Design an enzyme around this catalytic site. Structure first.
Site, PDB file in Angstrom:
ATOM      1  N   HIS A  12       0.758  -1.251   0.000  1.00 32.80           N
ATOM      2  CA  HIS A  12       0.000   0.000   0.000  1.00 32.80           C
ATOM      3  C   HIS A  12       0.785   1.296   0.000  1.00 32.80           C
ATOM      4  O   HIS A  12       0.163   2.346  -0.194  1.00 32.80           O
ATOM      5  CB  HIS A  12      -0.962   0.021   1.191  1.00 32.80           C
ATOM      6  N   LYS A  41      -4.394  -9.828  -8.063  1.00 29.27           N
ATOM      7  CA  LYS A  41      -5.115  -9.284  -6.917  1.00 29.27           C
ATOM      8  C   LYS A  41      -6.195  -8.348  -7.452  1.00 29.27           C
ATOM      9  O   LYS A  41      -5.883  -7.438  -8.227  1.00 29.27           O
ATOM     10  CB  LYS A  41      -4.184  -8.533  -5.968  1.00 29.27           C
ATOM     11  N   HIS A 119      -3.713  -3.460   7.852  1.00 23.09           N
ATOM     12  CA  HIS A 119      -4.750  -3.761   6.874  1.00 23.09           C
ATOM     13  C   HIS A 119      -5.357  -2.442   6.414  1.00 23.09           C
ATOM     14  O   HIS A 119      -5.466  -1.492   7.197  1.00 23.09           O
ATOM     15  CB  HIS A 119      -5.863  -4.645   7.441  1.00 23.09           C
ATOM     16  N   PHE A 120      -5.691  -2.377   5.131  1.00 25.10           N
ATOM     17  CA  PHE A 120      -6.292  -1.183   4.544  1.00 25.10           C
ATOM     18  C   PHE A 120      -7.769  -1.490   4.467  1.00 25.10           C
ATOM     19  O   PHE A 120      -8.165  -2.387   3.724  1.00 25.10           O
ATOM     20  CB  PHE A 120      -5.729  -0.876   3.157  1.00 25.10           C
ATOM     21  N   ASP A 121      -8.591  -0.766   5.227  1.00 27.82           N
ATOM     22  CA  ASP A 121     -10.010  -1.107   5.298  1.00 27.82           C
ATOM     23  C   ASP A 121     -10.816  -0.430   4.194  1.00 27.82           C
ATOM     24  O   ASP A 121     -11.624  -1.065   3.531  1.00 27.82           O
ATOM     25  CB  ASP A 121     -10.575  -0.729   6.674  1.00 27.82           C
TER      26      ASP A 121
HETATM   27 CL    CL Z   1      -6.801  -2.111  -0.701  1.00 29.58          CL
END
Ligand code: CL
Ligand code: CL
Ligand code: CL
Ligand code: NA
EC number: 4.6.1.18
Length: 124
Positions: A12, A41, A119-121
């Protein structure tokens, strides 16, 4: 074997550019961060801010995660991000992505010591 914090960075963080300036940004970046290796992905977001500014979100606005957990934080300010989404005509191994640049608040889940994003929410 990647730590959760390192995986977040690899997936990210793109501090080297202020924004995606090309339609091919996602195609190039999903490949170079090794997110197309065994599969495409389908969705991924890149953040164009310093790592320190993203880590600082873990001390900002505490909100619920989409899964109902309560270790998510929303940035007080908006940030430069790039959303990468597979096109309908994409199929491994020729992954193809749509690049959408925006300025939005980010929501991340934080864990550990030091307390950092894992984690990217979402973005809002
Ligand atoms: Cl993402
Ligand atoms: Cl890698
Ligand atoms: Cl509050
Ligand atoms: Na970690």
């Amino acid at each position: 074997k990647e730590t959760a914090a390192a995986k977040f960075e690899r997936q990210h963080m793109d501090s080297s550019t202020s924004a995606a300036s090309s339609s091919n940004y996602c195609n190039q970046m999903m490949k170079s961060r090794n997110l197309t290796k065994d599969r495409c992905k389908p969705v991924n977001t890149f953040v164009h801010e310093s790592l320190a500014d993203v880590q600082a979100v873990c001390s900002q606005k505490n909100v619920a995660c989409k899964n109902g957990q309560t270790n998510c934080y929303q940035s007080y300010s908006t940030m430069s991000i790039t959303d990468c989404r597979e096109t309908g005509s994409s199929k491994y191994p020729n992954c193809a992505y749509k690049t959408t640049q925006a300025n939005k608040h980010i929501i991340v889940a934080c864990e550990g010591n030091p307390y950092v994003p894992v984690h990217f929410d979402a973005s809002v």
